[PDB]
Each structure stands twice: as structure tokens, then as C-alpha cells.
Amino acid sequence: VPDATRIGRATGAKAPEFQELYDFDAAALTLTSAVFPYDSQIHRAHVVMLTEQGILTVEESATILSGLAQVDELAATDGSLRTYLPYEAALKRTIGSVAGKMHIGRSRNDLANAGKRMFLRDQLLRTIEAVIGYREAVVHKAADHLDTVMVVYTQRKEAQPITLGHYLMAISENLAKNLDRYRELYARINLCPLGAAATAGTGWPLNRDRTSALLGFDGLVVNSIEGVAGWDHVAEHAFVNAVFLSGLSRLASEIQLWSTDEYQVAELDASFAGTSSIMPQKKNPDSLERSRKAAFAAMGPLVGILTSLNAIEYQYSAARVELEPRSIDALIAATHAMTGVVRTLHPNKERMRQYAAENYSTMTDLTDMLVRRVGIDYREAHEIVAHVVITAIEKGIKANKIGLDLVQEAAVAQTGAGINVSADDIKDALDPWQNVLRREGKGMPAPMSVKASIDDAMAELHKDRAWLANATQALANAKQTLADSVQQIIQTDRKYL
Amino acid sequence: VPDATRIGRATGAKAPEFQELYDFDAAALTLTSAVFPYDSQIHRAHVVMLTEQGILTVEESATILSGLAQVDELAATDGSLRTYLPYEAALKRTIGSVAGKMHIGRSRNDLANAGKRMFLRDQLLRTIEAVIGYREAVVHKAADHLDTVMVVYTQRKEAQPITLGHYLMAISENLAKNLDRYRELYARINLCPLGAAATAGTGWPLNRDRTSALLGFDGLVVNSIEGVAGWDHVAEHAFVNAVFLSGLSRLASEIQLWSTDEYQVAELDASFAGTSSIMPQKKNPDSLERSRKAAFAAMGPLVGILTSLNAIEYQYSAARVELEPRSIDALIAATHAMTGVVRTLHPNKERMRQYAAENYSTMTDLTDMLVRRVGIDYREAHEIVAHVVITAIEKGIKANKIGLDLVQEAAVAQTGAGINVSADDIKDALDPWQNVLRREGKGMPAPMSVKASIDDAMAELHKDRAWLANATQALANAKQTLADSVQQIIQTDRKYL
Amino acid sequence: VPDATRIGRATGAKAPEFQELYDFDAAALTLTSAVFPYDSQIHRAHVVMLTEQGILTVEESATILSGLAQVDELAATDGSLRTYLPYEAALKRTIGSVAGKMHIGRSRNDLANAGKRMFLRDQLLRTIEAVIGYREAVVHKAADHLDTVMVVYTQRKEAQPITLGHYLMAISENLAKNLDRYRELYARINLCPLGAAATAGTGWPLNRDRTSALLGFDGLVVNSIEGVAGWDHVAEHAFVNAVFLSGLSRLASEIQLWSTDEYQVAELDASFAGTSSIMPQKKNPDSLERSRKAAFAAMGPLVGILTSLNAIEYQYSAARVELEPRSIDALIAATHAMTGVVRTLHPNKERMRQYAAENYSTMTDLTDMLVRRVGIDYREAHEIVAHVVITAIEKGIKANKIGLDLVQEAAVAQTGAGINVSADDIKDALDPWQNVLRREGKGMPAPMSVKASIDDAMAELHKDRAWLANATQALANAKQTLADSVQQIIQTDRKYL
Amino acid sequence: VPDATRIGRATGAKAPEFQELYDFDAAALTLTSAVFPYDSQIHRAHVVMLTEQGILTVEESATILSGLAQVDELAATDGSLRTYLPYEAALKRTIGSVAGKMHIGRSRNDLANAGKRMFLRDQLLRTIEAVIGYREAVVHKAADHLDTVMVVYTQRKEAQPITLGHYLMAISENLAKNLDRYRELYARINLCPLGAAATAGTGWPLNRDRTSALLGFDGLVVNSIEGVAGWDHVAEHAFVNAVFLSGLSRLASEIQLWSTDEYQVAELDASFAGTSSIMPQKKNPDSLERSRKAAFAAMGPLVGILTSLNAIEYQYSAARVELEPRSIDALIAATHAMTGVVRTLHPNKERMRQYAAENYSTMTDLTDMLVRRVGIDYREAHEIVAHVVITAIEKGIKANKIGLDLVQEAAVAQTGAGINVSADDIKDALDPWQNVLRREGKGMPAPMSVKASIDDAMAELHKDRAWLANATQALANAKQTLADSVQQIIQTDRKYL
Ligand SMILES: O=C(O)C[C@H](NCCN[C@@H](CC(=O)O)C(=O)O)C(=O)O
Numbered sequence A, B, C, D: 001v002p003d004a005t006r007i008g009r010a011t012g013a014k015a016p017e018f019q020e021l022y023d024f025d026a027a028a029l030t031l032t033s034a035v036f037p038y039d040s041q042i043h044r045a046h047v048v049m050l051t052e053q054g055i056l057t058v059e060e061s062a063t064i065l066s067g068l069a070q071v072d073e074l075a076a077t078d079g080s081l082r083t084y085l086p087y088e089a090a091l092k093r094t095i096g097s098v099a100g101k102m103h104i105g106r107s108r109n110d111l112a113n114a115g116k117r118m119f120l121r122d123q124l125l126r127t128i129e130a131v132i133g134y135r136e137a138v139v140h141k142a143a144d145h146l147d148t149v150m151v152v153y154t155q156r157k158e159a160q161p162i163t164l165g166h167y168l169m170a171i172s173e174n175l176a177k178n179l180d181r182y183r184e185l186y187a188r189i190n191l192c193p194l195g196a197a198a199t200a201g202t203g204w205p206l207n208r209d210r211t212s213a214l215l216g217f218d219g220l221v222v223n224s225i226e227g228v229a230g231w232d233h234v235a236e237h238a239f240v241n242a243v244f245l246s247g248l249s250r251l252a253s254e255i256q257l258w259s260t261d262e263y264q265v266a267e268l269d270a271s272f273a274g275t276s277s278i279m280p281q282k283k284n285p286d287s288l289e290r291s292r293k294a295a296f297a298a299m300g301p302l303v304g305i306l307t308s309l310n311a312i313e314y315q316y317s318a319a320r321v322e323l324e325p326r327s328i329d330a331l332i333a334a335t336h337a338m339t340g341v342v343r344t345l346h347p348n349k350e351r352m353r354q355y356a357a358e359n360y361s362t363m364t365d366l367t368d369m370l371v372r373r374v375g376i377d378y379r380e381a382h383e384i385v386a387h388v389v390i391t392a393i394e395k396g397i398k399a400n401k402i403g404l405d406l407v408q409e410a411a412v413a414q415t416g417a418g419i420n421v422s423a424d425d426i427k428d429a430l431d432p433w434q435n436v437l438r439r440e441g442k443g444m445p446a447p448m449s450v451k452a453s454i455d456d457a458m459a460e461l462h463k464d465r466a467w468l469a470n471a472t473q474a475l476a477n478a479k480q481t482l483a484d485s486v487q488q489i490i491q492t493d494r495k496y497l
């Protein structure tokens, strides 16, 4: 059965990234179902630690660990086993009273705080991976468009000429700092609260560093109150999502204006556009607007979480608002969609060049030229070029048809004095590509400086990938350490005891 | 004329920190008036750079710099000179057409972005200084209360025994990570956008690194669009303020509950409390509630700023919302007030000990004891102690009057089986100080572990102060470099030219 | 399998209202699945209108209507048919090309705006029903507690004596105005945008008033742009939810303080409390804190929706954020939970009376008494009673043990003058029940005035129920009109054509 | 000294409404200074009531009232007298101990709640007046543009043809419902809490209805707790401001796109545009973007206020966030600015008509035409017209140059079948003015239906003005009643006592 929205001008299939924006809502897990796999990992890690600490015998531990695998299997289909106390009771029904001993020195409070960290931890690595691929697509696009001259806007008005690659590298610098945020946050998520128990620790001699290590954490939440009352990392995760998505919404809005029927300087790839059921001419930026929607929605969890922390004491509280999987899924779907929008965007290079040459964004360089040459104050040159533009628009003269006559008229009419400049001097000031080439300092649109930025961004992207690989592998290693420590306790009880 | 609110039970004067909460609103500068001193610094730094770059002569530059000092003096009383173009025109009226040349290679867009960074930069150091003193007061208080036994709450219900010092060190760990946020943000605020001009750079050969260095920045905002469109640091500044203040509100709320007529476990210092004009018995937590008010209000700028970024393209925009001085002033006033609240808080140590011994927070250790000794599942011990508590409350027996009889009744009535434990075994489980001493792992309330936390926090506080001192001095040095470079250009033109 | 959380002090089953707070998240529909039943109603209403307008023949219409029933049945299990274009294509696969004619003069834009209104419309009536039952429970509780003397707090400090019924009638007045909000909003939701088509109307001669009427609306969204661009009713719905829930959170917080181990003036019904897996003494206010959580979370949709409207033009937009079913379900679950909390709350009337008599909330009436009798300024009487309290607390004298001696000491020590008042005059001022009875003006706690409020609230509740019944029946009538008009078109084509 | 921003293309002076956006921040009062005039009115009204109730003698009252006038005069310059207790003490210093008697039966809590209502009350009438003039300007503009054909957009893409007047009447309908919100809110602000005293009423026999009436209120906040704890009207005021401004931001954004260099379909009046200090071509929409800024900022108070209510109990609290004067001033400045933007907007009627005729917004009517004539399903006609557009764009044929050949090609190439339609049949479908005229149902762009909307809006505007006039006069009357009652008490004590 075909995608019924792919009709008329909406040709082909939705891009996969584009379809993600339609799928994430229905597919999102509840927080309970997203967190409960991490609970099972904590039960094993905690039990292993109790066995290493002699709080449980190798035989008690082996019994418990074999039962966890059993109840985990029941929980795959019995949703009622995905919260702790029902899970513990099922373990009791499976292996007997020894079940209860897995909760020695532990509470639901530090179990939940830890388990949710492990969830957000994986979702932070998932996010960094998405943002990295988004930066990768932006920089790779920029490298193909060092010569694609076009205007930059301020206040939605044409400002000066630049290049598409220069613009995209603004986004790259935006994302580099957002990746810094996500990495700095990871250092605060990946702290282990286990061992705080309810909020006050316990008399049982737990090895907190061992449980943290077996679960992939890079350190402890030390104080036990902070272990169960700490929630700022949830707030912060919501914020970084919000602010990163605000930049994604601004790129989305920028491309949507580029691709208006009126600008006509870029077109969405067919695979990232839809159409109307009533208006056959529509090529609709559904991917852009659903991506912006995610950015706006991301405000919600941020405010909900912060409101809830402002509402309580510095205690464990069940009143605290969570960052939900469906919010993070929205972020990933939008980042993926915009990664593909950027990769496949089709700029109309000739119309871009047309505006830059015709619609007066080169007037700064005409002004700079009078100052640099005839050496008048920037404020008097400005009034002349301003009158040049006023007169040009009245007479219907595009900026690239402005000549020595008009600049002389304006100079005379505004100062009673002509100006010593050549027709060539003027034509060169109004050449939008020359406007670009003159702008060659750091971070300016001249190809040589943009390419420099690209080289630096490509080196940072390598650092970005290496950081992610390390973080990811550090978790895979602990997770395999834990799995092995579990098979040991179990397999020896079976064979030699 | 005396403070008319200091009547009846509101004895003495408001503490200075307490009074700050009443003064910051009326005293707050507008953003314009707060930023315009930093504009004047940029004019000099920019001019100095133009002179070093030979874009201005030592004589042109000296003229301009002497005029800046003149217009700066006019602006001290003429508020209309605190935005750029009126300021530039006054400079023109002062020194002539050469005035206009200070704007060579520059825009209002990168001037404003840079100037607001310099403002927030100083306000970030001001904030870190306040938070540091807040952490200093919290840790110093904790060190005096390692023996002050009291209950910790979860869900506003007594949970287990701890100490006041253990609690305060939860706050210390909260603030350590908030100081990390503020420091990580400083690295993104202290980037120089100057040289981006409108958004596209310029053909003038500016030395961007020189202007950044003369203005105290630690690096550039490289890409020129990012220089004027970048606003995430404003968003982030608002967030860190919001989340830090959320923790301050939770401490404020905690102390307000401690100091209810019903808890009666702490009392605000007279200098941090008010009273009623109608109810003479009132000792009102005005300092706490006005501090919470600041935390709630801090939500506003955060949402306003993020909404505005979600509303635009990735351009310069005058639609962007700012972080205002009056919001930061509120944060400082509240941090100062709560620093003083904590320093001067008066805990009722006997009532604290009373609750911990009488109101059943020791029941965990009774349960742990049955498991550790008679070696029953935690879930069956739990039902017995739960019935102990149920029976205890019915009969009016406080937890420290619970004895072997009652635990035997409960065990029998719940399992038909007695339990091998001594009267001493039970009295020791219900001793709340022994509850503390047994909780001696990392981050738990036992004095030895809390003291450990304190030693670590004191070492971190030293690192905190050293980071602040370095940041502050790095700005004082650039500011004196700049001042000297200005007096040079001026004094030599006068004497040798 | 029993509820594994019902252990120790958590006796019996969760109340149904209490369990609702655990069930709503997993059970919540997506917006798509919640809205698509209303889409099917619009297809019939629209078709019926086209048939009445002769845009379709009784035979074309009958074919279409019979097919809608068929595809509706397919959609019960095929989730992909719950968005329009896939639904339309299935109708085509069912009845042929005539399927497409149901979209004559219509768009997805006005279909969606209308369908979401019909969804929120039903959810508004559902909400008003919940709030009504919440007000019913509050007033009914108040009527049973006109004599339950207790203190009112300001700033979490005991202020003056009142009654529990007086307090609950503050909530009643809060809810009356929230019901006004919900009713005023209903008048703006129940406007029909159908006939706006994409945004500009259509050349087809639709009878817009007929479609509105067949779908239960009470009027049109007239202008066609406003029909598809209008979203303020979604914003407003989110706000009213937010502000109503803020009051519910304040009652929840109030009861949670009443029921602290320290206040001890109210206890949650066993069926609305939980306990700890580690701490057997816990009677945990899980119902209160999960209700507050809903209130905080309700901030999110409000901010998301408003951000999205601030981000666009006054057009149809797919970037707009929605009010989701899971948010409304949270509101209903919390309103139900707190309805049951209030109905079943157990106040400790003796401890309430104890505080009112012992903890100095009667000092206002002692002050008022000196002014009313010995006729001194309220400010000098205030200083004396304030010193009475200061001295009383030092010496350990509860307010009901304050006598003529102490008031004489304070008067002398503060003014060198005694005061002509009797031991009876003083004992009467400090009688907290007499404090209540003297407060007998409108809205004050004296039984006679509270009962007055109750009578008025009971009359308003009758108006509240009657408004709801009318609104609900007006929709049931249109829905049966529509069903009948459909069976007519279908059954006559079958028999007489 | 001239406005230094009025240079180059920024000709003439800023419009007054435009300048308002630059002035409101520095000029905004603090809440304290904005509310304290209303405090003085309450002192008189309260005293008058006490005198009518015989709680004060005509001589005591006359003394007090004469002193209020004296301290009010001191407060004009002594800012420390603008909070109650300092004010009361100054009254004591002026007229003696009788000063204190003005606080009989009263608190700072119900004084402040009432005084802030009186402030917001006046600011609500001020807002309704601004919004009315904004609607007046929108409707009056629409009446001049029934023939100004132009395209409507959905998703920032051209949708169908309409008229500028049709668009503006969408805004009118938006504002009508926002005026309903403001009026419904006024009924909840204009309730008098005075007589609640601290929260529990008083034993003094106050006539609450008299004080309410003397102060212009239309009813009581009955319950005394609700009188000091009630804050939802503050929340709601913030929301209505937020949602109304969200619509103003959407109009602002719409006009800013119209007036891009690329759309070129409208131009801001010179008096509502600025320019660049560096780019002489800029005509900058500073008025639009500063108006949007206000809309975004208005999110802040809304979230702050709601967070604070979610953070407390249902008590008086000093933690509650306020709606500040500077926020309301921003709203008024933005509403005024956009009122003037709309009044003076210059549409380019020829370019508007050009797009409507050339850029394919008429394709719906071509599709509708094939269905209405050759009588094919809307879905097959849609594919043909879609291919017409695809082919048209490839060959460079504007929609008004589409002819019978191209529609035949598309029909054949898509169905192997030609189509019986005339060249005239097609040219008429593609005539954008005929597209308008055919859209003549309710709320559609045809002149006759828009004019209908205008007539209805003009009648509503009359109702809007009459409601405002009544509300305003009802306050002026009470205020003069009060002034007269004061001069009576004073002038008779002087002459006959
Ligand atoms: O004073 C009373 O009549 C009643 C009393 N008011 C509590 C709040 N007092 C301060 C708060 C502040 O200084 O921020 C205020 O009235 O502004 C009470 O309820 O105890």
C-alpha cells in the first residue's frame, strides 16, 4: 500500500529522515519501559557487589542472578514487572525468599536515580551521535559551496554578500559549542548515586565505587542526599536539548525563507517536501515545520522540570518532572531530518548571484570605497550611497547597473561636491564576488577563510567522533565486565558447589 | 528615620544581605545603562587596533581617543548618549568628522554582541563570587554540625537519621556542579565577536585577535555570522541562573519547613526574619520567600530568550530577548540573603534529636538488624517492623520506648514465630546517633565521612577561588594594557607631533 | 497477583482515583488516534451537507456514507488509516473514485482544525465534569467541618484561628472561577472552522452553518484564515489547565504539610498513601506528589504552544504545538486523585485545636481587645502583645496559659503603665473558638458565615451541573441528528432508487 | 539635537508609536511606585468605611484623612513612604497615635492584594483601549483594500488568492476574541479582597461591600483566605497578554515577510523603519522586531507567576511572582507600534496581483473547474494540474500564461484522455480576481463577504468601545464618590465640631 501523501508534486518516497518525524510519537516508549532494562543491569551489578563484599554467598548470588534473567524474560511481555516492587515480588515467586536480599543496602530512590541516569546517559550518546552527523552534513555541504555567492540577511533584509559555505560554517560553530554542552553535561549525568539508599546511606558495607564501575559510571554522586535529591542534570539535559533545537529551528526557518516562492534561492529535495490535497502547486516544507515544532515542544520539559525543582525541598521527591523518551525521540527525528535537508538542499546559484548583484547588498563596499579613496568620513559617504540607493530604486536601476553618473549626482546633490572615482572603481565595488573576496579575515566569507574554518571544523569533528567512541566503548566494556562477572558466579555454583 | 518594619518580634535591623532583597529592584540599571561603559572600552580597543593596523594615524587616533573620554563624560549625565549612533554623533560634535572613522570595519551588530558579552562576563564573575561565598558559608556551617543529629526527609516525611552537616554537604555538592556550569559558560561568553561587522566581516584589514586581547577575551567567535547571530550563551546564562536558583529555592523551602511553628527544629536569625503588622506572634521568613521569588522569576528570562531564538532565522535580529541586569541583581541578592541565612541559622539541636529518637526514622536499622542477625528476608522483617510502628502509634509508644516485648508481639502476630534478639540489640538499633555512626560509607552522615566530604569541599573551594582570581586578573590586566596603550597614543601626539 | 506496593503501612488497595495517577501515562492515546474518530464524524457531516446542497446526489452520498462506515471499521485496527489522505485512499479502494468527492470544498487544514476542536471540546466537558466533582467534594467536606477549629497559615507560619470548612471554601471559590474560565473557553473552542478549506474558502457553495450545526458547534469561525490559522483556544486550554492545576498543587502542598510527622493535624486515608521498600515507618503522600507533578508538567504544553505561535505568521502552519491527550489525562487523574484525597482526608481535630490554643495564633484578638477596650493605638498594643509572646516563649508558657500577670508585666515593661483588663477579658481573647466566632463577616471562618458560603456554593454547583448537562446534551442531540440523516440517505437509496 | 538614527534611508522622525518601543523600558515604574497611589485610595476608602461603621469618630476620621493627604505629598518625593509600614509611621509622625487606627481590621495582605488589583484593573482598561485602537486600525485598513488582490500563504508558501482586506479581517476576528478574554478577566480582577485582613477576617464589624463600592470594585472576593491567597487573576492577566501578543507577533512576522527585499509586496512607512550604520541600503523593520521581542518577553511573567503558584500552599505568600508595570508597558508600546504599522502600511498592489496571477496560487480553481465540468474525481484532476505546474515551471510558463495546450498535454500524459474544456474556461480559472469573486461564502475573500465581516466588526467595535466607556466611568464615579465623602468628613469637623 503506497504512501498516500506522495501525490502530484510530492514525488517519490519520503526520505527516511523525513519519515522519522511522522513515526517518533506513536513509537516512543514510556519512561518506565525505557528505564526498566537499566534496572535489571543495576540488580546484577548490585548483587555482584554484594557477593564481592561477602554480604551474599556465591550460592545466594548465583540463585539471585539466575532469577533476574528469568524475571527479565517475564517482563518482556508482562508490563507490570517493569517497576521495582512488582519485579521484586516476581523474583520472590521465582526463586524464593532469597529474592528480597538483592535490595540489601538499597532503596527505590537511589535505584531510580541511577537507572534514569543510565537511560539519559545512553540517550546523550545517541544525541551526540546525531548532532555530530548533523555537523558532518553541514561542513561537508559547506565545502561544496565556497563559490556559491549569495546574500546574508540581518533582520530578514539583505545585508552583504557571502557564500552558502560561509553561512553553513556559522551553523558548524553553533554545533561545536552545543557538542561542548552535551559533553560537559555527560560528565554530570555519568555519576553513580547507588549506595545512597533512601537518602542517608546504609549500615551495610557497600563498595560504592565497585557498583559505579560495573555500571559504566565515571565517578560517584558522593553525598547520599545529593544522590536521590539531585535532579539538575535532568534540568540541564532538557535545556541543552532546547537551546540546540532553537538553533536547528533557526536554520529550518532560514531554509524555509530561502525556499519561499518569492526568494526562490533554494529548493527542498523532493524527498523532504510534501504537497496539498487541494492545491496541486504546493511543494510544502513539512520537514522544516515539523522540525521547528520539535524545537518549540522541547521548551515544555525544560519548564516542567525546573518548575518542579522550584516547588520542593532538597529531598527525594516523587513530584519531580522527568525528561521523557518521546521528547528525546523528537529531538533525534528533527536532527536527522535537518541533517538530510542540508545534505540534499538544492540552491539556485544563479538566483542567489542575481540578488547579490542586483538588490543593493554591495552598497557597503561602495561606501567603504569612497572612504578608502577620496577619504571622507564614513557618515558622509553613507548619506551619498544611501541617496544612490534611493535614486536607484525610483528609477528602477539595479545595483549592478549603478554607474559613475548616479554616484556623481548623489555626491553633488548631497554635498555640492563631486568625487574622484572611476567607472572601474565603482563597478568593482558593486561586484558581489569581489565583495566576498575582500572579506578575507578570520570567519569572513572569502573562500580562503571559509576553507580554513572547514579544515578546523573537520579536525574538531575528528575530536568529536573520538570523544564519542571513547564514551561509548567505556560503557560497552563495563557492560561486558558485568556480564562476565555474572556468568562466573552462576557457572561455578553449578559446577563446583 | 528607623526601619518601620522592625517592630515587635522583628528585633534589630535587617541583615545587609536581607535588605538586599528589598533594594535590587529599584536600583537595577537598564541594559542600555549597564552595557554602555563596555561600549566605550570597545571604541578605544577598536581605535587602538586601527592605529596598530595603520588604518588610522597616531594623530587621528589620538584625536578620537581624547574625544571618547569627553563624550564618556557627557554620557555620565546625558542618557541619550548611551546608544551608539547618538554617541557617535556627539563625538562628531566634539572632535569633528574624524569621529566617524572609529566605526571603520565595524557595525552596531558586532559592537552590541561584544559589549553585552563584556557585561555578562563581569556579571558571571560577580555570580561565581556570590555562589562561592554561598558554598563557603554552607561548608563552614556543616563543619560546626557533624554531631547535630536530625532526621532527613523524603517526600516531606521523616526518613532516617543524619546530621545537619551531612545535609549541608548535599548543598555543597549541588553548588560545586553549579560552579562547573558557570565556569563552562564563561568559556563561551568570553569569546570576541568584534570584526564580524554587520554579519559578513569587512574588507578593512582588522586584527581581530588584537581587539579580542585588548578587551580581555580568551578567544574569538570566528565565523562572522555566528558573531552577530550567536545568542546561545545568553540562553545558557539564563538557564544556569534558573537551575542554580532552583536549588537555592529548595534549601529555602527546606529551612522554612524546619522553622515552622510545628517542626520547630530551626529558627531564622532575628536579622533574617520579619513580622506582621496585625499578628504580633509572627516571626516571618520574608528572606526565604523573597529568595524563592527570585528563583521562580528567573524562569522568565530563560523562557523569553529561548522563545525568541525559536522565532527567528540564524541571523542578527533585534527581536532577541536579553538577560537583563535586574534579573542578575535578583540572583545576587538572593544568593547573598541565603548565604547569611545559612551562616546565622539557629538549629534546635535538642528538638532535632528528639524527633530522630521518637518519630520512627530509626526503623530501618531495626529492620536491617533482624536481617543481619536472625537472617530473614528484608521483606518479612519489614512487615514486622511496620507492624511494630503501627502498634507503637496506636499505643502511644515513641520509637525510643520500643522494646523487646513489642518486637516479639509483632513477630509472633505476623509470623507465629518469635525472634532471637536482645533488649540491647533493639535499643542499639533505635539509638539515632548509632544510626548515624553505622552510616559511614562515602557521602553518608557519620561524622568521619562528612568530615571527609568537608576536606574535599574545602580543597575544591580553594580551586574555585583560584579560578575566579585568575579570570578576574586576566580582565584587570587587559583593561590596564588598554588604558596604557591609550595614554601612549594620546601623550605622544601631544609632545612629539 | 496482588499490588506489590501494598505492604507494611500501605494497607488495602490503592483507591481507584489514586491508581489513576499510575495508569494515565501508558494508557494515553496519541493525538492522531484521539482525533480520528472526530474526523469520521466530519466526513459524514460534510457529505450530508454536500448532499443537502446538491453538490452530491443522494446516490453518490449514500455510496460515500456506506464506505465511511467500512473504512472506519478498517481503521479500528489499521492505524495507518487514522490520517486523512491514507483514509481517503482506503475509501477509494473500497467504493471507487466517488471517494474523492467527499473532499469537495475542503482541505486537510480546516478538517484538522475542526477535528481537534471536537476533541478538545469533549475533553473540556470531561474536565469541567472532573472539576465539578472536585468542587462537590470540597464543599461537601467543608459542610462537615464548620466546628473543626484549626489555624490558618501565612508564609507557612500560624496566623489566626479558622476552621477546616472555612479553608475548604477558599478552594471552592478558587474552583468556581476556574469553572468560569473553562466555560468561557468552551465558547471559543466550540466554533466551527469547516468551510475555510485551505485558508481562503472555496468556490463550491457550501452551507457552513449546516456543517457546524450537524457537528454540534455553537457558531462559526467566520474568517477563513482564522479558521485554519486560529490556535489561541489551544493556548488558552493549556493555560486554564495550568492555572487550575496550580491551585490543585497548592491544596496538595497544604495537605502534605498538614500530614507531616511534625504538624500531625491531618492524615491521608490509607487508600491514598504508599510506603517505603526500606523504611517501614513511611506513610508516603504519593498521591499528593504525583498530583503536584501533573501541575508542574502542565506548564510544558502551555509554553510549547505559545512559543510555536510566537514563531510563525498568521497562517496555517504545521509547526504549531498541540495540547496532547496525555496532558489532559494527567489533569483528570490528578483532579480525581485530589477529589478522593479531600473526601477521605482524616483531620486530627484535637491536635488542630491544640495548636490554635497553644501556638499564639490568638494574639491578634488579644491586641484587638486592648485597642477595643483600653483604647490604645494598634501599634502600642502590638508591641505589648509581641513582648507577651517573646516572654511567653522564653518561660515556656503556651498561649492558653497566658494570664493577666504576663500581660501586665509586658504593658508595664513596655510603657510604664498597666492596663485595665480582666482575667476573663484575656482568657476570652485567647479562646481560639471565640476567635472564630468573632470573625463572622462575609467570608470569615465563623460557622454562620461559612455555612452561608456553602449555601451559595451549593447553588452555584447546581448551576455548574446544569451548564454541563446542557452543553453535553447539545452535542448528543447533534450527534444523533447526524446519525439519523446518514441512515436516511443510505436506506432510501437502497429501497427507492 | 536630532535623532541620530534618522540617517540615509531612515527619513523623517520615528513615528510616536515607533518611538514608544525605545522609551518604555527606562520609563517603567517599579511595582511599588505604580501601586502606592492605589494604597492611598484604600486608606481613605477604609477610613471612610470605619467612620460610617462608627469604628472611628468623625473627628478621628477627619484627622486621619487630612494626614493621608499630607503623607501622600511627602511620598511624592520620599520613595521610602511607598510601602505600608513606613507610610503608616510617617502618618504617625504627622498626626499622632490616631494614625495607627487606620489599620483597624486590616492587614498588609489584603491591602496589597486589593491595591495590586486596582493597579492591574486600570492597566486592563488601558490594554483594552490599546487593543481596541489596534482592531480599529485593522478593520479601517481592511475596508480600504477589498480590491487589493494578493495571495494567502500556508506554510510560508503561496496557497490561493485573497485580498489584503480579507487577511486583515482574520486579525480582527483574532482581536475580538482577545478582547473577550480581557473583558472576562476584568470581571475577576475587579473583585475586592479588603476585609479579609491577614487571611481570616476580623472581629471588627467592617462593611466589606462599602469598601469595595468606594474603591470601584464590582463585587467581593468573599472567602478571606481567597482574598489574600488568590493570585490566578495575575496568572491569567499574564497569559492573555502572552497569547494576544503571540498574534501580534504573527502579524508582525507576516508583514516582515511581505516587506522582504524578495517578496516586495508591502513596504513599511518610513516612520516605522530604521537603517544601518554601515549598510546604506537597509530599510530595517526595527518596529516589527521590537514588537515581536515584547511578545516573546511576555512569556516570562507568565511562567514566573505560574511557577510561583505551583511552589506554595493556598496561603498568603511573599514568594509569589508579580505582573510588573514594565511588562504591561511593553505590551502597550508594541500594540501602539503595530497599530501604526498597519495604519500606514504601503502595499505594492501591482506586485501583489503579479504573484497571484503568475505563481500558481490559482491552480485550485483550475482543478475545481475540471471536477465541476468534465466531472472527474478531485484526485485525478489534482494529478493533472500538478503535472501542469511541474511542466509549467520547467518550461518557464507563468500561471497566467497557461493555456489549453498545456492542460491537454498533462491530461493526455497522465490519463491517455483529453478533456473537454475551452481556452476561456481555463483563462477564467486562472484569473486570480475571479478566484477571489468565486470565494464568496462566509468569511471568504470576495469583497461582498469581507465587507459583511467589516460591518459586523464595526458593530462589535461599537460594543467594545461602549463596554470600555462603562467600565471606565464606573471607576471615575466611585473615585469621585470617595473624594466627596472625604471632603465631607474633613470640612464638617472643621466648621461644626
Ligand atoms: O503584616 C501583615 O499585616 C500580615 C503579615 N504579612 C506577611 C508578609 N510581610 C511582608 C513580606 C515582605 O516584606 O516581603 C509584606 O507584607 O510585604 C503576615 O501574614 O504575617
Ligand SMILES: O=C(O)C[C@H](NCCN[C@@H](CC(=O)O)C(=O)O)C(=O)O
Binding pocket: A106, A107, A108, A109, A198, A316, A318, B154, B155, B159, C274, C275, C276, C277, C278, C279, C282, C284, C286, C290
Ligand atoms: O509511587 C510513587 O510515585 C513513589 C514511590 N515511592 C517514593 C518514596 N520511596 C521511599 C523509599 C523506597 O521505597 O525505597 C521513600 O523515600 O519513602 C516510588 O518509589 O516510585
Ligand SMILES: O=C(O)C[C@H](NCCN[C@@H](CC(=O)O)C(=O)O)C(=O)O
Binding pocket: A154, A155, A159, B106, B107, B108, B109, B198, B316, B318, D274, D275, D276, D277, D278, D279, D282, D284, D286, D290
Ligand atoms: O533599533 C533597533 O532596535 C535595532 C538597531 N538596528 C539593527 C540592525 N543593525 C544594522 C547594522 C548597523 O546598524 O551597523 C543592520 O543589520 O541592518 C540596533 O542596532 O539596535
